[PDB]
Amino acid sequence: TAAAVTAGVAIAKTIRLESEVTAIKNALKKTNEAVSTLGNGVRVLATAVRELKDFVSKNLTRAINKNKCDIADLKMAVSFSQFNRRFLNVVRQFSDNAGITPAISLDLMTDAELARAVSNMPTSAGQIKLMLENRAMVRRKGFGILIGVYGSSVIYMVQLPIFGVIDTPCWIVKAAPSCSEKKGNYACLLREDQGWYCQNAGSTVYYPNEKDCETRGDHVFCDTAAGINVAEQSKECNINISTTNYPCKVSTGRHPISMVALSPLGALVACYKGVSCSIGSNRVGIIKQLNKGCSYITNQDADTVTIDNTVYQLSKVEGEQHVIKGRPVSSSFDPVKFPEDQFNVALDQVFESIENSQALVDQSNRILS
Amino acid sequence: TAAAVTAGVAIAKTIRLESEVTAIKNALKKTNEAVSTLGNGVRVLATAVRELKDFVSKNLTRAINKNKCDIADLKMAVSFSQFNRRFLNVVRQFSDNAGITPAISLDLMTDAELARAVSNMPTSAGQIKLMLENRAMVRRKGFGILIGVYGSSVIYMVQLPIFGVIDTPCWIVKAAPSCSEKKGNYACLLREDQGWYCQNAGSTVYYPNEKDCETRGDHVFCDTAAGINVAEQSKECNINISTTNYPCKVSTGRHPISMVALSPLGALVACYKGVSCSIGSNRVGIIKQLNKGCSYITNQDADTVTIDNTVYQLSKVEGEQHVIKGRPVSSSFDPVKFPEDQFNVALDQVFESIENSQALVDQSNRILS
Amino acid sequence: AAAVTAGVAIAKTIRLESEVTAIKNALKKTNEAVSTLGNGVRVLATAVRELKDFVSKNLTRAINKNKCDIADLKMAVSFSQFNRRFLNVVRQFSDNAGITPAISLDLMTDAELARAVSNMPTSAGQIKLMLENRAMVRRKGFGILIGVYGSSVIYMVQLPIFGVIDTPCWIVKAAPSCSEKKGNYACLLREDQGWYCQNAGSTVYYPNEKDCETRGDHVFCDTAAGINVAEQSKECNINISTTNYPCKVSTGRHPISMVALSPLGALVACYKGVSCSIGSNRVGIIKQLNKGCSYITNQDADTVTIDNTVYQLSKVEGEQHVIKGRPVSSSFDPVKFPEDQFNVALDQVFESIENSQALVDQSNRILSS
Amino acid sequence: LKESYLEESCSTITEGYLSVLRTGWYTNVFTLEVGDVENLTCADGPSLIKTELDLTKSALRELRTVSADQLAR
Amino acid sequence: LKESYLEESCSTITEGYLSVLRTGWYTNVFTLEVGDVENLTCADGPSLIKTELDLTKSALRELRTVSADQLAR
Amino acid sequence: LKESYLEESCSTITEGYLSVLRTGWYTNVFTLEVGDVENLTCADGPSLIKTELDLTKSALRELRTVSADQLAR
Ligand SMILES: *[C@@H]1O[C@H](CO[C@@H]2O[C@@H](C)[C@@H](O)[C@@H](O)[C@@H]2O)[C@@H](O[C@@H]2O[C@H](CO)[C@@H](O)[C@H](O)[C@H]2NC(C)=O)[C@H](O)[C@H]1NC(C)=O
Ligand SMILES: *[C@@H]1O[C@H](CO[C@@H]2O[C@@H](C)[C@@H](O)[C@@H](O)[C@@H]2O)[C@@H](O[C@@H]2O[C@H](CO)[C@@H](O)[C@H](O)[C@H]2NC(C)=O)[C@H](O)[C@H]1NC(C)=O
Ligand SMILES: *[C@@H]1O[C@H](CO[C@@H]2O[C@@H](C)[C@@H](O)[C@@H](O)[C@@H]2O)[C@@H](O)[C@H](O)[C@H]1NC(C)=O
Ligand SMILES: *[C@@H]1O[C@H](CO)[C@@H](O)[C@H](O)[C@H]1NC(C)=O
Ligand SMILES: *[C@@H]1O[C@H](CO)[C@@H](O)[C@H](O)[C@H]1NC(C)=O
Ligand SMILES: *[C@@H]1O[C@H](CO)[C@@H](O)[C@H](O)[C@H]1NC(C)=O
């Protein structure tokens, strides 16, 4: 059996080998099943990546460009109202008063423009100076007129006062009935001179109502239309009423009249017959009851004249004092950022796992040679 | 011998094996190509996935934060206008009227502030009540003054009327020429009493023009400046014009004057000489011809007085009635939603296929060991 | 011979024994590559998952957030737009506290105004004139806030009815006519000055020039200001000393030097110590006026000077401005995705999967033989 | 136009004007309503449109106080 | 109200009105300040609110020129 | 200023004021134009600014009706 020992081992190894390649066939059979499976993972992953792009590319940038447009939409609307304020403010004003403006508003003519107009007025240097200092009055005593809407343009005119007469002596007259009585009979005089007087060249201008002249400091802005020219000698009435040089305008009455007439610095009081005329103070109530007749008191003498139960205020009554501040405006910007680092490393990971696999199938091919 | 047979089968079987391994060699050679090939799919997917991030990470979030920024900008602009209305409105008014306000506007002083002021005025309880009830009139009879712009603060003053005298008797006088004729000549007297009379303590106040006093119900809001103090005895002129008790103000003429004078509750008509004066209705032209002389008719007697071809209306003529509503404001909010459930099913799919592919190569390795 | 076959058997089997162990090692490398590529695809997927996690959650949220503010602001701006009239009308009644100086464009539109005038109770020609001067209709009219009920504003507009039109009208101006003999002055001055409008059966007198407004040849006169005078009063403009009418004329004993402006000219009164001169805007002085009353035309000169006081006969035309706002632009800059180069890469991916898949089918094909 | 100088009375008459005289008042009544506005519930708290309405609501509440008839207050 | 026709003088008296007479002036003083506004540092240069602030800054500079006291200019 | 009481005539003179008297009118003429706005062609139809333009164009169509010269209507 010498041969058989050797012959026996050969078939023995062949049996050991025959079962080995069938194992490898089965191993490989599972392997390309894994390769095929991983492929279907990558396919589904790719389809997911495709569906992710389609949402980002189409459905999402759609929303962004839309919001991008609405943003541009509102910026244009809001910018329009901003860059065109004056135009829009002016159109508002000529509409609210239907074609004319009570004053030369800030929108109607800017301060720069206002000053430039006043300096080019046809007058003396000193008068230009005064208007410049009281430009508020220039605006209010003036006005604006809508000329027309031509196409898309608004044309209007501002009309400014020319203050040619300034800094001439000026004064105001106030009066009460000066009633005198003897034996139950009343003789009542009343000046009818009463009003504003401003001295002018060759004449004195008389403004019968107090509102006809506006007071700002020592200066008096008097309405031209209201003026009545009177002879200068009319001023003589303030020395002697019974002057024969001027027909001092004075009226007579037969009946007593009780009243209070307020002056710039005081008040004239007339107490006659059945009236209880008294003077009052800020804190206390009565400081003096007034004698029957014509009395004159100062703003610094008292704050109150009382006639029966009627209290007349001599000066303005100072009231509460408020302070108001708007709600704060704050910014709401909270940007979004993508955490790129953790991701970017993960992709490097991928390209490297790619690189390792690619090399391993190269080793496998080598081994096969 | 038996050895030769077994070895003979062994050598034969090796031939059968060489052909299995030569197919397996070729089979694995193909598999390694699939692994290498699928990898170039995965890599191209990774580079593709990388540019998708580059767009999202950079180009897309850039556009969003820009839009997020403009959004915050516009909100600030619009909030500023909202949180500071009163401030901006008050500046608006002092600019339109250049420093002064015709009335005490709602922006200048709120109802709360106004009522608190009136309640703190120096007068009697009933007078405070009346002002509170006619707070409309209070605002209009008052006004506002811009004191100064200091830094970013606007400081102004409101000036309110103090109605200290209330609920005393008041009346209004209207008159037309009263012409009498004897043998073709006309003698015409006409009262000059016409106007508002208000009774006060110790005197009667006379307001010459109907516009000098404002009517709100039975109450008459009279301009102090227009007022003329007259003797109480003057009311006697509405009984006898020719009374010796008061110097009744009445003018005489030599010529006839035909006219219509309107009353609160009616109208005075004066028809003389060559005029055809009649009373009419709104529908029918004439319902009665008026006799020559002075006639008095009621707002309830007629709706119209005609003098020749001039038609005078006794009451306000009621016209159309409009009703207007603004366009409805709708929301344009349309959110975008991402299908995360559907998407996650695909990713769950990928992650299983990975584990399935991974698990099969493990079977493959079990098979080899 | 028997042993010879046994020797060859071991020989071929050993040559095969080394080959399958080479193949076994080859497959083991491959299974590590499949396992390696898989650990890669998994890492690629987790990254794609996080990309979705960012897009799906954090990014669309910011977009919907911006989408909401966008919708918010669009609503705010639309509200003010769709409700301008409402908001403008409420503004005006607040600024003037319940009343309106004019019939503003917001209170009653041009269409509404015209329909109203056409339904007024007057003649076709009177309707026409109001339609022609509707600006005046608005200003001579006014508006009243009747009430705010819930969220609705109810108000009434009040329109003038111009029933008398196209009857003769004229205006009177005068200066003191002072006469001198032997150093003594006799000065008469007309006091009839003002607007006269002829009416049916009478003539109406408007004492102040402001009481009537001039628009072209037409004179719009305030009814309240009007005083009825005998038709013979016009006779004063022929002979002042007419006995037919009591011409209202005042006498003086003192000289009054002044300038009174007429529509087409001016009356000058030079008496005593005044230097009255006539000037132009271009040339300085053109004529010194003789003592007494002079009448000059607006086309005769541009200026009357009294001493150093300069009176303007006409309006002085100043600068002439033109202003245009800043331009408003769109900031719309959409974002676009580079889709073409990308999608080729996905197609690239889908083929490498199917090319790979086709290869694992081949691997198995060879194995099935 | 024609303006004549009357030298005996140191006066001027200017004729050729035409009259426009008010003989009555014609009145229309208006009711202005604010248009409906949707509730924007996609936002939290302070809406820009919510505060614009509360502004217009108070403007009306304040405007009410100056209305002509008392039974509106 | 009662309106009586006076045939002797061709006049009418209408009585029954009640007086409201002004006896004084009562004054309140107000100080309005603009609310604080946050700096928008997410933008560069021309923002809608900076252009809104410089507009209202300017409105005040002009409003100033019309102040009551001279010492405010 | 100083205010003197005249006891004989029950009157008061207040002196020390200074006159500012109007002697003429000075006029400037203005022409206001609307700023240019780009056409917003990224949107379709109802834009907030087109309705804002069509609103002020309408505001002007109405403002025209009250212009001073007739040849503008
Ligand atoms: C106020 O003046 C009257 C009148 O005098 C006038 O002024 C003078 C300067 C002179 O020009 C007079 O001719 C003026 O008439 C004084 O009253 C009367 O004066 C006249 C003189 O003409 C005399 O005959 C009368 O007797 C005087 N009457 C009385 C009652 O005395 C009056 O004195 C002057 N009052 C004051 C306070 O000075
Ligand atoms: C406008 O909407 C708010 C909020 O409505 C809520 O949000 C919806 C999406 C839904 O969840 C509703 O059920 C909610 O009511 C109105 O409601 C106020 O909302 C708060 C809580 O958000 C609630 O506690 C209050 O009770 C609600 N107010 C009232 C008076 O009931 C709000 O009222 C709406 N405004 C108008 C004018 O209709
Ligand atoms: C009007 O009055 C004439 C008399 O005038 C006075 O009237 C009364 C009030 C008393 O003051 C009296 O002393 C006066 O004499 C009368 O002559 C005349 O008849 C009266 N006319 C009428 C219509 O009553
Ligand atoms: C995405 O957009 C397409 C049209 O481009 C549409 O059919 C689809 O329903 C949209 N889906 C989502 C969730 O927006
Ligand atoms: C994204 O939103 C999540 C909530 O799901 C939050 O926890 C996270 O902090 C946010 N991160 C980024 C980068 O936006
Ligand atoms: C995307 O951004 C890059 C810069 O990061 C730029 O070069 C490219 O043009 C942008 N593309 C688009 C469509 O905005």
Residue numbers in the entry:
A (entry chain B), B (entry chain F): 114 to 482
C (entry chain D): 115 to 483
D (entry chain C), E (entry chain E), F (entry chain A): 19 to 91
What did the authors write?
In order to advance our understanding of hMPV F structure and antigenicity (which lags behind other paramyxoviruses), we engineered a homogeneous preparation of soluble hMPV F folded in its postfusion conformation. This process required genetic manipulations that were not necessary for other paramyxovirus F proteins. We also crystallized the stabilized hMPV F postfusion trimer and determined its structure by X-ray diffraction analysis. Refolding of this intermediate leads to merging of the viral and target membranes concurrently with the assembly of HRA and HRB sequences of the F1 subunit into a highly stable six-helix bundle (6HB), which is characteristic of the postfusion conformation. Indeed, we found that 101F binds to hMPV F and cross-neutralizes hMPV. The structure is similar to that of the related human respiratory syncytial virus (hRSV) F glycoprotein, and two neutralizing epitopes are particularly well conserved, thus providing a structural basis for the cross-neutralizing activity of several monoclonal antibodies. Although immunization of BALB/c mice with purified postfusion hMPV F induced very limited cross-binding and cross-neutralization with hRSV, the elicited sera had robust neutralizing activity against hMPV, indicating that the hMPV postfusion F protein may be an effective subunit vaccine antigen.
